[PDB]
């Protein structure tokens, strides 16, 4: 019950929340610190080569 | 009728000072 059925994970964050009436429902506001810690891989295509080059 | 909204002590301090 503590290592198979549920477990620790990776790629996660945890803060407190506050309202905002300038975000529509499918949006969520994330601090720049959290978005600097977290990440997500992308595969390099012809389409995104320049943008990923700039971003590197 | 005065309903007493705050505190006071030193009037009774001198009150017993001259009642003594």
């Amino acid at each position: 019950r503590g290592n198979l059925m549920g477990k620790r994970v990776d790629f996660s964050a945890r803060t407190v929340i506050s309202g905002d009436p300038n975000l529509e429902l499918d949006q969520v506001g994330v601090p720049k610190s959290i978005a600097k810690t977290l990440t997500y891989p992308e595969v390099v295509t012809p389409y995104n080569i320049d943008r990923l080059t700039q971003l590197v | 009728t005065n309903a007493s909204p705050f505190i006071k002590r030193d009037r009774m301090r001198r009150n017993f000072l001259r009642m003594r």
Binding site: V9, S18, P21, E24, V28 | -
Partner: protein
Amino acid sequence: SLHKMSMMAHRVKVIPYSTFRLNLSVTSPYNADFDGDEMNLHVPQSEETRAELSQLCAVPLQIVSPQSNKPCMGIVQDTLCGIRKLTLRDTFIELDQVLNMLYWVPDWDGVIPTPAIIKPKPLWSGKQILSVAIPNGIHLQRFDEGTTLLSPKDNGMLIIDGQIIFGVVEKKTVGSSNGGLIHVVTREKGPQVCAKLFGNIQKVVNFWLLHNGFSTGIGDTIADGPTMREITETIAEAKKKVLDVTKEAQANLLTAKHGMTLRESFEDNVVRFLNEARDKAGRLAEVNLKDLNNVKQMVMAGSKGSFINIAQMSACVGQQSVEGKRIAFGFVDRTLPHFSKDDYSPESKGFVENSYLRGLTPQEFFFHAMGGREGLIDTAVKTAETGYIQR
């Protein structure tokens, strides 16, 4: 997490000033006030998982709750109060305000609707401007209890083609309900337009609420003299009825109500009398209360408060309770050591006659503490048992 919601997906807008940030409408599915709660994030890592997460777990295709076939979203406190405030026949908007509101609506097509009045003056009605946020081709009817198609009380609802025609917007229209507007638009037009609907409505009503202002305070809670006097004499005659019953009981002639023991009948009669007294007094206070009273404005505007809340803050608290029976003689023959033995007058056994405005005599304060403690311990046991039996 307990039900199908509370794992919902979102798009991300990065913001400064470290904390999370989310729209107010999605608050109740998460079941999370901002008293210091905390959420969790989970970043997907591949294309399959990003795609299935966006196509299933995203919020806007989960408006209708599968568990109870009515939408779980809605608009809430501030915008609800503001939207009832804005939708009244007795209010109006001028040109500069309506221009700013129209620019606040993001998908606004660039046409200004002609005002209802050119009268000597250009003024728009709140219904008229709010109809801009409603998209076109939507229809709805209410017809509750008044509504003779010339609605004098302005209750009910009607929309032709995205335009309000009459009716005060209320939670029975724009909150979560079975024939609600949100339900209608999600079932009809397409279940992602409704997200933009919340955005538009929330933005415009929030702007207008900023420039109108709304508040409340003590003077909402205070009552009027003659009504207070009537409350007092109402409770007094209730006490008289109780005393009459006690005399009859102590004179050993009673009907001895069937299915029940003598003392049970006596207790039933007195508790019935006291609760009737509380209800009558609360009704009296409410029907006195002015239309400019803000707690009345919220309570008939949906969001917060209740009839019993108004009654308890102004008229009377009512009889305290410890599992149905009122407060028992823990001390021998008496409830509390400030009375002589063998009483059943309601103030001795625990009727808090008084009201939150006037405060409580200390015995009544103690009995109030009893009732609250009972509620707390019941919560603290039921939560563990219901968690086990959910698992």
